[PDB]
């Protein structure tokens, strides 16, 4: 894995790769690492695959029960804390999860929470999580400004995953883009690295290390 | 977590046209010490099933008691206990297979390898294997321990697939089993000369043979062999 999500002028961008690994064996190239909890909440998946898939869909069930009981959509803080308190109960048992709870509510505004399997829970504007997080940080940090346009922000997220997909051996497949606004999340397509790399190389003039 | 102490070696078996044959030697080994020589490792259940057991003997004796108790329990409130509602080989097997897998799942296994041979009520031959891990499988020929390595190759020359079963008589099948037992005596360091053999036929029923011996052995060429 490589997953990122950053806050900016026009809301939140969330971008993930789609590769699954079993050692050096490429298990899948078409995995969904973003889970749509509700029209205003997203969850990213990094680490152990069943762990992420099982507990994040479980998280969605707890969020649904909240809005049934409280007649109100759960806050990003409360949603993230349900998940962090859960994994803390399993601390030491060997769960492997690197997650980001992204979403919008009225009281909070656009919010991102990093939650991992040691029980670390952090609010923040920028996070990159997974085996290729460093590669994504390299591109994202060096190009990030708060005043990015929706168009430029979408691309930077896409380009940052591509950067990690290229260098990190345990990342790749395709890029899944999302954009979170006050009106909810919007899906911005699946982008296969097979075509996206050459399209980016040609148009951007980057990736000069590769034989053109 | 166990370690086996007093142990039994190979159990071998095969199908033939009208039924099944099964055999196992009468030894209870204590490591390299050939401690006990009067051990029966074939245990009949009713008049239509024989259970052959290898591995730990204390665990074998426990399984004996379970089968003994199963016959008693089946007879309770059962007017057809000796007819339509008698214990089938398939019932006895599934029961053991359940126990074996439950015990391995509790990290406290019955340290055995088991072959259930018999004939079903509709005349069909039954032959299936189960071990300490709860692993199960069926085949025209089945064998445990060294038997798997040495007996199966010989028995598979007689019955290589399903279509070879109707073509195999009880005379041919028993001859192959007795031959295999001799080969095991030559080559298995924890085997004995004395053994038991059982035949379960759909017509003649259960024939249990005790106190058999390996015979017609080739040892004479030994005199010609000198040094290394």
């Amino acid at each position: 894995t490589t997953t990122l999500a950053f806050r900016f002028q026009g809301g939140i961008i969330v971008a993930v790769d789609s590769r699954a690994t079993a050692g050096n064996w490429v298990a899948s190239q078409t995995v969904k690492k973003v889970i749509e909890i509700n029209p205003f909440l997203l969850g990213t998946a990094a680490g152990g695959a069943a762990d992420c898939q099982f507990w994040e869909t479980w998280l969605g069930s707890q969020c649904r029960l909240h809005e049934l009981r409280e007649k109100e959509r759960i806050s990003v803080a409360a949603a993230s804390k349900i998940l962090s308190n859960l994994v803390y109960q399993y601390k030491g048992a060997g769960l492997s999860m690197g997650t980001m709870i992204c979403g919008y509510t009225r009281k909070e505004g656009p919010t991102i929470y990093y939650v991992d399997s040691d029980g670390t829970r952090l609010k923040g504007d920028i996070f990159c999580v997974g085996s290729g997080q460093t590669f994504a940080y390299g591109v994202l940090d060096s190009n990030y400004k708060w005043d990015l346009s929706v168009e430029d922000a979408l691309y930077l997220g896409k380009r940052s995953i591509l950067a990690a997909a290229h260098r990190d051996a345990y990342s790749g497949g395709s890029v899944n883009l999302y954009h979170v606004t006050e009106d909810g999340w919007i899906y911005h397509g699946n982008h296969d690295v097979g075509e996206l790399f050459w399209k980016v190389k040609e148009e951007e003039g980057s990736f000069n290390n590769v034989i053109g | 977590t166990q370690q086996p102490i007093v142990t039994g070696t190979s159990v071998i078996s095969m199908k033939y046209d009208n039924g099944v044959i099964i055999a196992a030697d009468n030894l209870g080994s204590y490591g390299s010490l050939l401690r006990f020589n009067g051990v029966e490792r074939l245990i009949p259940v009713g008049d239509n099933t024989v259970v052959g057991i290898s591995g730990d003997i204390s665990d074998m004796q426990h399984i004996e008691r379970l089968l003994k108790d199963l016959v008693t329990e089946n007879a309770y409130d059962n007017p057809l206990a000796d007819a339509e509602e008698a214990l089938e080989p398939s019932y006895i097997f599934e029961y053991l297979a359940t126990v074996m897998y439950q015990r391995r799942s509790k990290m406290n296994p019955l340290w055995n390898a088991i072959i259930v041979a018999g004939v079903q009520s509709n005349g069909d031959q039954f032959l299936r294997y189960v071990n300490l891990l709860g692993v199960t499988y069926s085949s025209p020929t089945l064998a445990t321990g060294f038997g798997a390595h040495m007996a199966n190759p010989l028995l598979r020359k007689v019955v290589d697939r399903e279509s070879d079963i109707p073509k195999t008589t009880v005379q041919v099948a028993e001859e192959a089993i007795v031959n295999a037992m001799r080969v095991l005596y030559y080559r298995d360091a924890r085997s004995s000369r004395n053994f038991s053999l059982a035949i379960i036929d759909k017509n003649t029923g259960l024939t249990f043979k005790k106190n058999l011996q390996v015979e017609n052995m080739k040892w004479d060429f030994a005199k010609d062999i000198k040094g290394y």
Partner: protein
């Protein structure tokens, strides 16, 4: 030791190397120069096990300087890099191997081309447009994949390098106390004093 970078541009090779020397819970020095001049147009930066690094660098330096005097001629960067690789390739199957990773930046005067070689302690050599050793590469490679162009100037290369150092200072766990930058071109080797 820890951070050593390298960038080859149109007309020069730029090497950046961290100044910190740490041991236990103390930064013993913050002005350390992790490099040796092998010849007038060849520079080698190094990083790895304490002691091994300097001992190896100076040993190579002595050998190249000996060759220069003997033949009254400067070895090509390619030739020096192959010599260094072979020494490390011997080393790895010794009783106690040199645990040193190096970058060799040089200007080939016959070809009029800059050259950057990355060699690890196993003796694994590769020519690259940009290189790094240790954890640095996990940030800089992807960054350079994006921002690097082959026809850049030395000034453009230094700005590209500043972008790397800023990213490392932001995301690396350890304080490496900045870097010493050196440029290798047709006119030889010189140090950038204000970085």
């Amino acid at each position: 030791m820890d951070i050593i970078l390298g960038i080859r541009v149109q007309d020069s090779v730029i090497l950046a190397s961290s100044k910190a020397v740490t041991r236990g819970i103390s930064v013993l020095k913050d002005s350390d120069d992790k490099t040796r001049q092998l010849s007038p147009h060849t520079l080698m930066s190094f990083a790895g096990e304490a002691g091994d690094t300097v001992q190896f660098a100076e040993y190579i330096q002595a050998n190249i300087q000996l060759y220069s005097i003997r033949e009254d001629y400067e070895l090509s960067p390619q030739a020096v890099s192959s010599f260094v690789r072979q020494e490390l390739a011997k080393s790895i199957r010794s009783r106690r191997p040199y645990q040193v990773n190096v970058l060799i930046g040089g200007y080939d005067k016959k070809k009029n081309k800059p050259e950057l070689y990355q060699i690890d302690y196993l003796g694994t050599k590769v020519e690259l447009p940009y290189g790094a050793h240790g954890y640095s590469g996990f940030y800089t490679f992807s960054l350079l994949d994006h921002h690097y162009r082959p026809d850049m100037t030395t000034e453009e290369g230094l700005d590209l390098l500043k972008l790397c150092v800023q990213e490392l200072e932001k995301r690396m766990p350890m304080d490496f106390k900045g870097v010493i930058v050196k440029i290798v071109d047709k006119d030889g080797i010189r140090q950038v004093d204000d970085f």
